[PDB]
Structure 1
Amino acid sequence: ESNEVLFGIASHFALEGAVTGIEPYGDGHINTTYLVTTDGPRYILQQMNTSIFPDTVNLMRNVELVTSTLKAQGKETLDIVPTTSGATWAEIDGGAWRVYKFIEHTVSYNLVPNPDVFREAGSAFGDFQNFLSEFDASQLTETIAHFHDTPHRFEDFKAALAADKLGRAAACQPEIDFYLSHADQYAVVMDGLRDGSIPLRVTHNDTKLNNILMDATTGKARAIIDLDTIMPGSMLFDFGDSIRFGASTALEDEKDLSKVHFSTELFRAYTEGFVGELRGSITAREAELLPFSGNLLTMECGMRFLADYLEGDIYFATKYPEHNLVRTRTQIKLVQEMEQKASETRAIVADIMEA
């Protein structure tokens, strides 16, 4: 939006410096995010996507509960900057806006540069699972229904495919047929949750690497950010999604497929950190499904990218027409390698589970 509008938005919030600039920031696909520069402190300003999160009140109640609980344990988290009237967010001209303090002295990654970073990521999310277990499910109402219900996502995909709104299906038969042919695999976690063989836990639900901030000196995790999808789920949702994004040797939207590989060394690093925090709570069935949770969350994200492509890119932010097709192709390549390397990942998990 225009600067005049954005500076106007900023005036609603209890900022502690004169605003010098407001610039688009980051590579989130969901909310619209800006960096607020002032004559002193920095801020993150976000317009919340109400298409995706229609219940702003409940979303912000969840974020408030999580952050306040963290604060009350002396743990660094997202710091909501209230409106000048003391609200946690503002509705301004049909849009929903919030502000967080900018988290200083941090670095973040779209791509793992070495195993130590990814091990730290694993430790961070594993520990966060322990933290979240202090809530009961009723405290955190789901902000999006069926969020990691892969069979439900597959129904959405099949509908998008059948409608073929833009006639884009013709150019992506191999990708479409990949998702269709994997239909027998999608229900494994949901079935286990439904019959009680997989514990229902409170989870983060979007554990991609760029949602953690590492300290610029120590390299230790400083804060987990993007708290919008904290709700009941399976541990496997958080594990699988982390492996999806972070065990790849390439960016999520890497055009050159020959650069895209699933790294078992990176898998090992994350799992060491993750399981290292959760050894006392992880069940036999959860441990058994750790490798496949990689496949599943990658296929889920991929079919979502492709469905969006087939629907004309209504859900995810895109930079060019084919962007979601480029995204779905990396996810497919990753799953193909995860399948091929299955015995190796199983062995890695078993080795970590005993030690």
Structure 2
Amino acid sequence: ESNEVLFGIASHFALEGAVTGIEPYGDGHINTTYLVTTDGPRYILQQMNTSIFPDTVNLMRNVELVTSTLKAQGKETLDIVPTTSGATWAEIDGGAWRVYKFIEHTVSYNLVPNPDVFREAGSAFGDFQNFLSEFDASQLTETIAHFHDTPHRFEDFKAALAADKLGRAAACQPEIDFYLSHADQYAVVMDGLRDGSIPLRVTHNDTKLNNILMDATTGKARAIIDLDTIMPGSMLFDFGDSIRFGASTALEDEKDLSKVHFSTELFRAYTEGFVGELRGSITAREAELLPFSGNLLTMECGMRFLADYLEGDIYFATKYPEHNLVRTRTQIKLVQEMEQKASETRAIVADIMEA
């Protein structure tokens, strides 16, 4: 948006300083995020993506419930800055906008620099699972249906493939055939949720590493952000998605595949932190599926990148025409290595579950 438009939006909110700038900020793919600089405090301004989250009222109800529950336990979280009339968000000229306080003195990572950082991530999301267990499913309505319903995602992928709107399929047959060949593997968690062998839990559902802000001095997790997808699911969605993003030796959009590897050392570090917090609640069946949850969420995310490529990049923000194909390729490479290391990761979980 133009400066005039953005400064107008900012005037709707109860900011505590004169605005000096509003500039696009961050590595988010979904909403449109801006850093608001003032003569004092900083803020994050977001235009919510209503094509992805059409029910803005229900989304903000969830975010308000979660954050207010955290605040009422004295725990740092996203602090909604209300409109000047007290609302949690504003509809302005056909757009939905919200503001959060900028969480100060933090660092975050798109790539794990050392195992200790990833262990801390495990602890943070493991702790968040315990926190979320205080809610029953009925209090937090789904903001996106079938969100980690991988067979449903696969139906969407197949439709995108058959349509082949842009004629992009010709150049990515190996990637396409990887997802088609693994069709048999996509239902394991959904089947377990449906038959009761996997507990339905309230989960975060987007547990990539850069959704944890860590303190710049202590290195400890300060807050979990990106709260839009909190809804019922399986623990395995949170665990798997964390491994997908954070157990890689490379960025999600690394162009050089020779740099992309699945690290069992990082897998171990995360699992130590995560299971360390959840040892009391994790069932036998959940533990059995911990390694495969990595494969599953990486395949789901990968297929979603490739479907989006085939559809002309309507879902995820991209920086260049082939960006989503570059992204799907890293996810495939990762899964190829998770398959190769399946015995090793099984052993890691068993070791941790005992000691």
**Counterparts of residues 1-355 of structure 1 (less than 5 Å):** 1-355=1-355
Displacement, 1:283?
0.2
Q: 2-side partners of 1:121 and 1:21: how far apart? A: 32
Q: 1-side partners of 2:220 and 2:27: how far apart? A: 22
Instruction: Encode CA deviations 1:89-115: one digit per residue, 9 max, x unaligned.
Output: 000000000000000000000000000
Residue 23 of structure 1 aligns to a residue whose secondary structure is strand
Displacement, 1:352?
0.1
Displacement, 1:214?
0.2
Q: 1-side partners of 2:137 and 2:181: how far apart? A: 34
Residue 228 of structure 1 aligns to a residue whose secondary structure is helix
TM-score of the two chains, using structure 2 as the length reference: 1.00
Displacement, 1:270?
0.2
Q: 2-side partners of 1:233 and 1:143: how far apart? A: 12
Instruction: Encode CA deviations 1:287-337: one digit per residue, 9 max, x unaligned.
Output: 000000000000000000000000000000000000000000000000000
TM-score of the two chains, using structure 1 as the length reference: 1.00
Q: 1-side partners of 2:7 and 2:167: how far apart? A: 41
Residue 227 of structure 2 aligns to a residue whose secondary structure is coil
Q: 2-side partners of 1:220 and 1:211: how far apart? A: 14
Q: 2-side partners of 1:19 and 1:280: how far apart? A: 48
Q: 2-side partners of 1:247 and 1:25: how far apart? A: 25
Instruction: Encode CA deviations 1:187-209: one digit per residue, 9 max, x unaligned.
Output: 00000000000000000000000
Residue 254 of structure 1 aligns to a residue whose secondary structure is coil
Q: Which runs of 4+ in 1 moved over 2 A?
A: none
Q: 2-side partners of 1:249 and 1:153: how far apart? A: 26
Q: 1-side partners of 2:186 and 2:140: how far apart? A: 25
Residue 36 of structure 1 aligns to a residue whose secondary structure is strand
The root-mean-square deviation of aligned C-alpha atoms, in Å, is 0.2
Displacement, 1:85?
0.2
Q: 2-side partners of 1:247 and 1:24: how far apart? A: 28
Displacement, 1:235?
0.1
Displacement, 1:41?
0.1
Unaligned runs of 5+ in 2: none
Q: 2-side partners of 1:269 and 1:246: how far apart? A: 10
Residue 228 of structure 2 aligns to a residue whose secondary structure is coil
Q: 1-side partners of 2:272 and 2:167: how far apart? A: 45
Displacement, 1:152?
0.1
Residue 15 of structure 2 aligns to a residue whose secondary structure is coil
Q: 2-side partners of 1:21 and 1:250: how far apart? A: 33
Residue 91 of structure 2 aligns to a residue whose secondary structure is strand
Q: 2-side partners of 1:191 and 1:130: how far apart? A: 24
Q: 1-side partners of 2:83 and 2:192: how far apart? A: 43
Instruction: Encode CA deviations 1:264-300: one digit per residue, 9 max, x unaligned.
Output: 0000000000000000000000000000000000000
Displacement, 1:57?
0.1
Displacement, 1:226?
0.4
Instruction: Encode CA deviations 1:135-190: one digit per residue, 9 max, x unaligned.
Output: 00000000000000000000000000000000000000000000000000000000
Instruction: Encode CA deviations 1:1-39: one digit per residue, 9 max, x unaligned.
Output: 100000000000000000000000001100000000000
Displacement, 1:210?
0.4
Q: 2-side partners of 1:22 and 1:257: how far apart? A: 36
Q: 2-side partners of 1:211 and 1:60: how far apart? A: 18
Residue 335 of structure 1 aligns to a residue whose secondary structure is helix
Unaligned runs of 5+ in 1: none
Residue 261 of structure 2 aligns to a residue whose secondary structure is coil
Q: 1-side partners of 2:55 and 2:74: how far apart? A: 29
Residue 229 of structure 2 aligns to a residue whose secondary structure is coil
Residue 289 of structure 1 aligns to a residue whose secondary structure is helix
Q: 2-side partners of 1:94 and 1:134: how far apart? A: 36
| Count of equivalent residues | 355
Displacement, 1:75?
0.2
